[PDB]
Design goal:
It is classed as membrane protein. 3 copies of one chain form a homotrimer. Helices cover 1% and strands 58% of the residues of chain A. Chain A has 341 residues and is mainly β. In chain A, strand 15 and strand 16 form a beta hairpin. The complex binds beta-D-galactopyranose (GAL) (3 copies) and cesium ion (6 copies).
Chain lengths: 341, 341, 341
């Protein structure tokens, strides 16, 4: 037993950026770019086999498959092997981060890469990723279900395998989930004694060029909401903080930012309008308030369901970053199509 | 509903090149090289879903899959998503160029890459390609069927997305087709206000190293012929011209070349002999006659059909390029196998 | 007719290296590295079609598919097209080397790349590989079955296609096999008039940076053993020798090394313990005895079969290389899982 699946999603997206620093014409406005873009098409193979008494073996190989022909490689999307049974589920491989799964109730938009921060809640999703790791998921007991996941010190840094001279970048991920009559709330987060971030607060591999080492890197996320009776509402809160670990005068100083995201949608028959807001409060960088990281964004859109597998998509987004003259505003809109197989 | 398809084609090809400039031994003759080569094996996944009243959703991901293990990546061959119905068909993605489809009645040979110009009509097919774009194909009305296709300015040049400082490389492609009782004629072509060509008259991405910018780049192709009753005959004509747009003394001057190709084949039971000729008249480069682009080529061969999906292939080709001492002659022959699945 | 297959295999492996030259702490011992690693997962598509009277067409595209997401490309594992029938089988493409197939009775261990020499008989398998080539396999007559395979001069070196100025790196591979009532012995080997080796006695492509050209490169392997009644025993012998062909003072001098490998395993119900030993006698490099190439290794382990397709794996290995102060000792152990589909 093995099945083939995936989804092909593409559309045309119009965008324009307002930046006074990089564009000098007309009050900092760039020209409007119109493109055909892949919304992240993917194709995978998964299978399962009953082993006898309550245990089943499970594997999956999923790849990024852009219909523009820009992707390549196997298992770059969730791909794994594991075992399931009464005890729950245990998987190893390129695995989604518990915080990446919790992303399903946080970001419901589709878009191309270039517009992932204005046509989708991309900024609050800068903490999500896939890591080579092991992961446990306990069954659903009384509406409760949980997940614990770990990334080895030698998987987070291979170069340092035999000479442990760099602080371990090993990390733990966990999440808890409660569901009842259409009401659901969940906590998801991750902690890393030592890790590296780029200037976009995203986690990068040790020794990336412009990467800033950090200590006690922790990410927290709580998402609660209602999903049933043609109605969907979702509020999410997220806190991120770490201590500067880059040798120099500012080592030890604190980094932190709070983000909130809101989304609601109603299902009229085959049309589902939807709206989402997101904000990133002023961020503390090296102990000081940094307003460059503050942002406000709102996305409105609707999905037309031709069938349970095919949808037509339309959406627009207004995004503002920073404050003052270093400020950047992004507006974009798209129309596209999604087919799940 | 989703299907798996592709074809595996390989063979051994013998070749020798006669060039007085690069080879000094024996009147300019090179040694004879004999290789095992992939004839362009490929594998793809496509699927369709009825949406209700006369509309069907359609997608396809096809990749180059060489059995020599030299290819990599997804959707580098025609890959797309679109909709079909009474109105015809509409597709977006890595799509074949209307001129690339018209190639089916122009080049019927199989070969490895190194011999695509001597074991196949490759020179007349230097205008064919795949471009990220949208494309319309109207139904077949009274033997008539048509196709209109467009490649965005920001898809033909991504770097220039927000600062339109480079002339648009957006292009249009169209073709018309008539079929009646085994008789068929079609026009296919493309126009680009601005584009770039390499010295082989092939279109390359803006800012390729040795790439010459051009203006009013247009390609025309007419192919007519008979295909039925065990008989196949096909004549094709092709015109290409553009104005030099490379800043300097020769900007504005005219480039152009006319190419013709002929092919016929008769089906004795399971054997199908075939022969093809092709010529490239002297080309006008910067207004001046250039005989380096002139060429003559003839390919003879036969296909043995073991079954409708499997064939045995044999072919030879004599090709002469240019005139005089800069002249190059290529001769090659091959025996191979093709399995379609 | 076409089928999908492959296997997903991963596990965690603990390792430590003892080298006095590269590690200075504690008598040359490195720290112990613990990793999650792909044991070489792979996925392929193969198909066959009856052509009529006793002939069938056969093709296969197999790719390395790591569940860690580190592989990419098509047909990098055995991939081919060919014909089968009364006469036996004939294939062309990325094909396994006759010596690579004989590897099945020589190395029965699973492991990640980093531990292929301590958790598997990797050193004796440094002569195995895949080469673009043609290959014949004659049927099994009276327990006897044979294989002859060849790699073209222009496939082993493409750059030199038209100017044969580098000595041909074309090579021949052959093997013979006898099987009777659980008893089986086979010879497998390869010869190359000219070839290139790296310092690990592995064959590399001409013009690799640190590659040493050789002449009369021959590899011999005899493997005999018993496989039936829950019992498996296998002894293998291997000889390798070539003449230095690197221009200089030592050209012409002789290189050679003898390797032996032993493995046995008994099948209690679903558990199969197993043990293997391997030795590499002192090697003659440029006529002189080199003890750096001498080695001793022993691997113990067991496989728990959950089902015919799924197994649980456990293994450990002690490996010593060289002699004296340049000496290197490797110890490693792993626990993992393998699912065949
Ligand atoms: O949020 C959008 C995504 O939803 C998933 O369930 C689906 O597998 C993807 O193809 C994509 O449509
Ligand atoms: O012209 C040759 C080609 O014909 C196509 O129809 C087929 O899909 C390919 O596999 C290749 O055989
Ligand atoms: O030696 C181990 C291998 O055995 C093969 O037969 C199987 O196809 C592979 O998946 C791997 O398990
Ligand atoms: Cs992300
Ligand atoms: Cs990552
Ligand atoms: Cs082409
Ligand atoms: Cs192209
Ligand atoms: Cs090997
Ligand atoms: Cs090789």
């Amino acid at each position: 037993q093995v099945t083939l699946y995936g989804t092909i999603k593409a559309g045309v997206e119009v965008s324009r950026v307002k930046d006074a620093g990089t564009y000098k014409a007309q009050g900092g406005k760039s020209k409007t770019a119109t493109q055909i873009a892949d919304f992240g098409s993917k194709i995978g193979f998964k299978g399962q086999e009953d082993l006898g008494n309550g245990m089943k073996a499970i594997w999956q190989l999923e790849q990024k498959a852009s219909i523009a022909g820009t992707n390549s490689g196997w298992g770059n999307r969730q791909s794994f092997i594991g075992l399931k049974g009464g005890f729950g589920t245990v998987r190893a491989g390129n695995l989604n981060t518990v915080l990446k799964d919790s992303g399903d109730n946080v970001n419901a938009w589709e878009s191309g890469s270039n517009t992932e921060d204005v046509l989708g809640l991309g900024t609050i999703g800068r903490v999500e990723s896939r890591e080579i790791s092991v992961r446990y998921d306990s069954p659903v007991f009384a509406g409760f279900s949980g997940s614990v996941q770990y990334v080895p010190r030698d998987n987070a840094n291979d170069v340092d395998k035999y000479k442990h001279t760099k602080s371990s970048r090993e990390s733990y991920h966990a999440g808890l989930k409660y569901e009842n009559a259409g009401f659901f709330g969940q906590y998801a987060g991750s902690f890393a004694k030592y890790a590296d971030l780029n200037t976009d607060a995203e986690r990068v591999a040790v020794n990336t060029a412009n990467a800033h080492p950090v200590k006690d890197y922790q990410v927290h996320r709580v998402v609660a909401g209602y999903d049933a009776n043609d109605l969907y509402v979702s509020v999410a809160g997220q806190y991120e903080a770490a201590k500067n670990n880059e040798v120099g005068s500012i080592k030890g100083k604190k980094h932190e930012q709070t983000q909130v995201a809101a989304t609601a949608a109603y299902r009229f028959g085959n049309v589902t309008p939807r709206v989402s807001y997101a904000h990133g409060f002023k961020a503390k960088v090296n102990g000081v308030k940094d307003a460059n990281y503050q942002y406000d964004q709102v996305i409105v859109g609707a999905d037309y369901d031709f069938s349970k597998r095919t949808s037509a998509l339309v959406s627009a987004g207004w995004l503002k970053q920073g404050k003052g003259a270093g400020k950047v505003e992004q507006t974009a809109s798209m129309v596209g199509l999604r087919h799940k197989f």
